[PDB]
Design a protein around this ligand. Structure first.
Ligand SMILES: [Zn+2]
Ligand SMILES: [Zn+2]
Ligand SMILES: [Zn+2]
Ligand SMILES: [Zn+2]
Lengths: 74, 76
DNA sequence: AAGAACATTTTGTCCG
DNA sequence: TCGGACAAAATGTTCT
């Protein structure tokens, strides 16, 4: 289809199992491969759009997981 | 408390009128000069502390202004 | 589709 | 106190 399931920007393909833009693709890989310690400054329900996805990596990562992203998709 | 009034990190001086840390000092200068247009992804009430201050420039910048930071603190 | 390298943006430290 | 340069972290794009 058309839109990233994580941030609603234009998708570039099906990455890690889910339709996402390229920025969310590489965010999720880095998140999964790094150490998890992200902390929301809100209530763990930040809105994640094209502009606001840079705000909260904790909620952006929860949204990647909720969308079903996983490194071993293939 | 030698604490930054914006994020509670260790303050380094009175910058632009307010006891703040090095990071909040330059963040504030950068926000006004670029006349930045920040948007909160919460509720306009994010927690701003040493770690989370990176997460919402909108609430960080709001706390700066509200604490009374002002580029013309001296001129004043 | 996915990984890597390059690029950019955003933030933070150190001087003077 | 304040500014500049440098440095680092965080995000994003191109893969001639
Ligand atoms: Zn996305
Ligand atoms: Zn959040
Ligand atoms: Zn501060
Ligand atoms: Zn906020």
């Amino acid at each position: 289809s058309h839109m990233c399931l994580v941030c609603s920007d234009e998708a570039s393909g099906c990455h890690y199992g889910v339709l996402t833009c390229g920025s969310c693709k590489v965010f999720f890989k880095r998140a999964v491969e790094g150490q998890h310690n992200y902390l929301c400054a809100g209530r763990n329900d930040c809105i994640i759009d094209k502009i606001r996805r840079k705000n909260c990596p904790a909620c952006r990562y929860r949204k990647c997981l909720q969308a079903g992203m996983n490194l071993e998709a293939r």
